[PDB]
Amino acid sequence: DEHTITNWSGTHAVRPKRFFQPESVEELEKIVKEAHEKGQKIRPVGSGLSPNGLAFSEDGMVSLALMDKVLHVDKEKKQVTVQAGARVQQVVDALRPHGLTLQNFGSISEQQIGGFIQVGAHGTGARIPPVDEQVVSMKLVTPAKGTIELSEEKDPELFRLARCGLGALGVVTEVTLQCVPRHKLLEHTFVATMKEVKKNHEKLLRENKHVRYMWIPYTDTVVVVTCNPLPEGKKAPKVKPQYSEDEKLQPLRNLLREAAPETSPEVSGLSFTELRDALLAVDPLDTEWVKRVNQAEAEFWKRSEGYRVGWSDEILGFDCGGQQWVSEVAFPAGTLEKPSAADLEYMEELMRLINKEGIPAPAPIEQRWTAGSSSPMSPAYSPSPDSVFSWVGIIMYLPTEDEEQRKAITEAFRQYRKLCETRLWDKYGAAEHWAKIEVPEDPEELEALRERLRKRYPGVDKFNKARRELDPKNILSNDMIDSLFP
């Protein structure tokens, strides 16, 4: 096959020897039977977007992109049954006329339902669990046992394991999700100091349906975004200083005119995100320069306070348009009833570590919250139904297609992430997002990662027993899965 599959950020790519794209469940069953019989690789792939290339296998991959129909809406239960190849956007568009939406959304909507659930993807909202916990039922095509129906009523132990199964336990053909009524949100964006955030944090998380913090390294600016249901006819309030787009961008444009080349015709057409990339591109690993870029960004956010009203699917998405390295961890932050400071303590220690080690850390460091999941492979697995997890995402941008700048940033990010891993993750019980975890080549570092996984997931041995039972010739797993779970 001549199909090349590249991830979002162009950090991983694969050209599979065999690429299957069945149009029917019947065709997929035949593919899985035949691959099992011959011991041929068929790793499942959705949109192929994962930052770590989790789906990729040079031997063989199977895509259900052509199996993308909404099969049934249950009005009374507010549930949707969809083929696993549908993109989130496609399900959202199909649910609009039914007055339904998904209980939550990440920053993008071009993921397939299969790829979304299999990694335990999440949005924000301390009372709202990750998407795997929103799965009511599913159908799973397995090498060793054929097609199996799973739910709380049908083999709940395997259901909970396979709905967040990393593509290793079977090919998911159909998913039933728990929806909520279609609704408008009021989004409030405001800037705070570390000290102001600490004062109001406990209440803010419990009194706002959605909260996200955007921490700006080397500044005392935190951008707070809250979203709440908008009563029937309420209008967006208006902030008393009104800044034009040009006034918001002024600090970034002024800074860019002070680099080795306030606006030209070429600088003028740059969005905020394009301007941030143009600034970092000057000297992306020079910490003194990144301090100045981050301070100019804080000034942009200070000029961007205000309110927006929109349908939840429009409002909860946000811009990750630029290629980047990301790492995100989930760690426990008590419960709705028993608050914990760990979420803010983590961020204080991270900011201190960045400053001490001289990390050229750009903005933002994204902080979200979810409820716990009952899926044993969820990074937010908890037996507590009112558990709260904090999710912290660090980033470095790849502002150009220049191969040598990209390598240097790649190495810089490996070191930034390793410092968080060695200094913070064990202390806070932090677990890496499955779509962002990288396999170290250093077999020492690999064994330390395997030990962290066994500590974070007491479910690991049961996952590997299900892999042996359902996929004994290992046709669904790639080198990454084999490296993480030997």
Ligand SMILES: Cc1cc2nc3c(=O)[nH]c(=O)nc-3n(C[C@H](O)[C@H](O)[C@H](O)COP(=O)(O)OP(=O)(O)OC[C@H]3O[C@@H](n4cnc5c(N)ncnc54)[C@H](O)[C@@H]3O)c2cc1C
């Ligand atoms: C710009 C960007 C923003 C993002 N924002 C967020 C965010 O806000 N929140 C968040 O939690 N994540 C986020 N992610 C991560 C994203 O949700 C995951 O990478 C997700 O898995 C992507 O879906 P996909 O369809 O591309 O899956 P792929 O990357 O193709 O596959 C992911 C996994 O699903 C498995 N798989 C796919 N289809 C099937 C199937 N039918 N049956 C069985 N296994 C299957 C694959 O084997 C693999 O293990 C973001 C990613 C990007 C690139």
